[PDB]
Amino acid sequence: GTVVGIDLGTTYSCVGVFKNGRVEIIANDQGNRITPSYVAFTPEGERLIGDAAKNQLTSNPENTVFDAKRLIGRTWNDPSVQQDIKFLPFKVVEKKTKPYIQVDIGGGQTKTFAPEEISAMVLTKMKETAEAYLGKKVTHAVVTVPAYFNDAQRQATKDAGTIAGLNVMRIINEPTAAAIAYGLDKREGEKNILVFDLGGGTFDVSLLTIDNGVFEVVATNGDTHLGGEDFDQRVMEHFIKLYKKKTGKDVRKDNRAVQKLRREVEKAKRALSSQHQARIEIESFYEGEDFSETLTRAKFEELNMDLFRSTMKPVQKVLEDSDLKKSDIDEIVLVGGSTRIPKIQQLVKEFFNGKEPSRGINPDEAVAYGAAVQAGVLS
Amino acid sequence: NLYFQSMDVGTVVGIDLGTTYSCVGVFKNGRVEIIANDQGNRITPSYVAFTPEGERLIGDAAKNQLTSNPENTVFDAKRLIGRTWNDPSVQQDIKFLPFKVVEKKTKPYIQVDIGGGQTKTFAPEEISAMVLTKMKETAEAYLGKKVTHAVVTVPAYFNDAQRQATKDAGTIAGLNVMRIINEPTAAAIAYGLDKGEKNILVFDLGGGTFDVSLLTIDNGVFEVVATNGDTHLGGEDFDQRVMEHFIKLYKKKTGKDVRKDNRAVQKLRREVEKAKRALSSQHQARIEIESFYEGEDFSETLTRAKFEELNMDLFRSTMKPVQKVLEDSDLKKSDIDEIVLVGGSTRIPKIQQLVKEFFNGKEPSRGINPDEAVAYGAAVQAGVLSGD
Ligand SMILES: Nc1ncnc2c1ncn2[C@@H]1O[C@H](COP(=O)(O)OP(=O)(O)O)[C@@H](O)[C@H]1O
Ligand SMILES: Nc1ncnc2c1ncn2[C@@H]1O[C@H](COP(=O)(O)OP(=O)(O)O)[C@@H](O)[C@H]1O
Ligand SMILES: [Ca+2]
Ligand SMILES: [Ca+2]
Ligand SMILES: [Ca+2]
Ligand SMILES: [Ca+2]
């Protein structure tokens, strides 16, 4: 019927549709165009998806599930799983040599879910937000995945669709989707495209060569665990030790203070993508005392200096591996929420000797945008 | 002979001017009171830092900023104080200090950028002066009075040039140092070992130095009979073994080599250090650093057994100088009446266990906080000079 395009992202997902000549990115029933890729199990037996799952994360660390994409379609033995496991606050147990996620569901009950079951529940949220908008049922979808995903990861993403009641007609590589979003599907000779994708917890760089609807991912690279969250973390550290210094108080063991801080740091960072200062204020922050500081853009870039510079290495590396030089790159496509950071943009611009990157698509929505275009072609 | 405090000028302080930390105490109201600093810490890092912006930092704030400001953060000044340039100790040390040490008038001087385009050159005793000034001020905030006189401790092996240079450092700081006393003697005094003829072994293992001293006491007369040790072995080395294990392990679990990233290394060091301290009173320590390297996190458990294994050879080698002081002082291990263990690293259970086994089960002395014992003893002598 009407096929949806879904960006099923690490930290956020996005659903779009092609209806009456254009791509419509669909707002969820809480008013947002992207939805958190979170699922929570409450004590009272209630299953929450999205924003509701995420606002309930501090109070429910063990049964708020996220980052399912990091596990999806992998075996227990994957070195990547072996590391990730140590940092997830929910239980992951080995079963049939695959990661399974184990949560309490209330009434004394435990369940284990395959990562793809958890992703399934995210897809069910996207499905329902699509159907509400379209006024009708949705059964088919184009879902994107990272370019370095192997068959078992792709198949597992397809299985998620099925668990969710979607037929995932096509799986499309995220950089190709971003490429399609910017009209690089237009038939206009051979082009070498660098897609620089920077989300909340992951950095992917992809060199794609395009040739009249023939897309090839030549080389891929990145930092599997570098993202927007890390930039929040540099700033958190700065402020926690500044708070100690002024008030004598250390807040690190107080999960309530810490996460109120994280929440305001997150708001501050976002704002510092289009202002040079943001006031971080919290009332009754710690033992009755308030918190007030202004963060400058200068201080934000200073505290993240090297994380920002180190995004250049995977770029140089993908040009080496595809036997190209920076002069060979015809479009630079910047996608992922964190590419809104002017310094990131500036460091990329500078790297390519003044070339401006393509413009006119929303970086938070680009991958879903591309998927939706192809959904509309597939029909 | 006797010092009389007034209403404006307070009692005599005892100071442990140590290699990596210092501690100041006082005898007041019949007890030794070990004075906490403005940070709430009962020991203070023996560190001075000179920021770009012209601020001189001392203690914890100097140390807090050692990675970002390596060339202008000074420490280990005790390693150079009262020594000639030609001293083989100095020639070795300067190779390893991250701040500049030039020769002036045949003596080592420390040269730092003091802000505003200027450099200054400080004698090691000027740097210890600054540490002593922080200790002075800590005392004065506690006493609500000025502090003008002190008893300061030094290693048994210090010579006259080294003792004089410690006295001069007090002098630069405004402290009349009434008495210099040996650290192990100070440690003996804190355990009451001054109140027939006893033989005392003092095992002092700090952050960077290991000092063993054999001491006789006869009717309140102390004599340092033999001294030995490893002048560069201390708790910092035990961190170094654990650091190496994790840099290696991290490379092979994740591919990532972090060795030349000083921010990551410093971050690991802080957590290894905290871990170590915790393994002196529990059997496992978590080491968790968020965004350790290129956004990737770090998470590992260090067990006490793993900690002992990594340092096995280092711990056992602390027995060789204990044997040498016995040989050199012509005593058998059975001639030792008292074992005193002091220094923060003697909190390590395996170190306690090795010393105890070396003396066929003999228990060490116990009533005093091992990183405060040197100060405590100094503080007690401070009291006898002030009339209590
Ligand atoms: N205005 C902004 N400035 C800086 N970072 C932003 C902004 N908006 C979103 N981000 C960051 O984008 C990250 C999420 O990227 P996104 O692509 O939406 O999700 P995913 O992590 O699933 O790829 C978050 O860390 C968020 O803070
Ligand atoms: N609980 C503990 N367990 C193990 N080592 C400790 C503990 N507390 C302190 N230390 C070690 O003691 C060393 C410092 O000893 P100290 O006598 O305080 O100073 P100095 O080095 O100036 O003699 C440090 O290496 C520190 O890690
Ligand atoms: Ca994304
Ligand atoms: Ca050493
Ligand atoms: Ca990260
Ligand atoms: Ca000591």
Author numbering:
A (entry chain A): 28 to 406
B (entry chain C): 19 to 213, 216 to 408
Published text:
The 70-kDa heat shock proteins (Hsp70) are chaperones with central roles in processes that involve polypeptide remodeling events. Hsp70 proteins consist of two major functional domains: an N-terminal nucleotide binding domain (NBD) with ATPase activity, and a C-terminal substrate binding domain (SBD). Hsp70 proteins bind and release client polypeptides in a cycle that is coupled to an ATPase activity. We present the first crystal structures of four human Hsp70 isoforms, those of the NBDs of HSPA1L, HSPA2, HSPA5 and HSPA6.
The major Hsp70 protein of the endoplasmic reticulum is HSPA5, originally called immunoglobulin heavy chain binding protein (BiP), or glucose regulated protein-78 (GRP78). HSPA5 has crucial roles in the assembly of ER proteins and protein complexes and the unfolded protein response. HSPA5 crystallized with ADP and calcium in the active site, and with calcium bound to a secondary site, whereas we observed the products of ATP hydrolysis (ADP and inorganic phosphate) and a divalent cation in the active sites of the remaining structures. Only the HSPA5 structure contained ADP and metal ion but not inorganic phosphate. Metal ion coordination geometry and distances suggested that here the bound divalent cation was calcium, which was present in the mother liquor. Thus HSPA5 may have lost magnesium and inorganic phosphate after cation exchange for calcium during crystallization. The slightly opened nucleotide binding cleft of ADP-bound HSPA5 distinguishes it from the set of NBDs that crystallized with ADP and inorganic phosphate in the active site. Cleft opening in HSPA5 is brought about by rotation of subdomain IIB by approximately 5.8°, as determined using the DynDom server. This mechanism of cleft opening is similar to that determined by crystallography of Hsp70 proteins in complex with nucleotide exchange factors, but differs from that observed for actin. The largest rms deviation in the Cα positions was found for HSPA5, where the overall rms value is higher than 1.3 Å (only 17% of the backbone trace shows an rms difference lower than 0.5 Å).
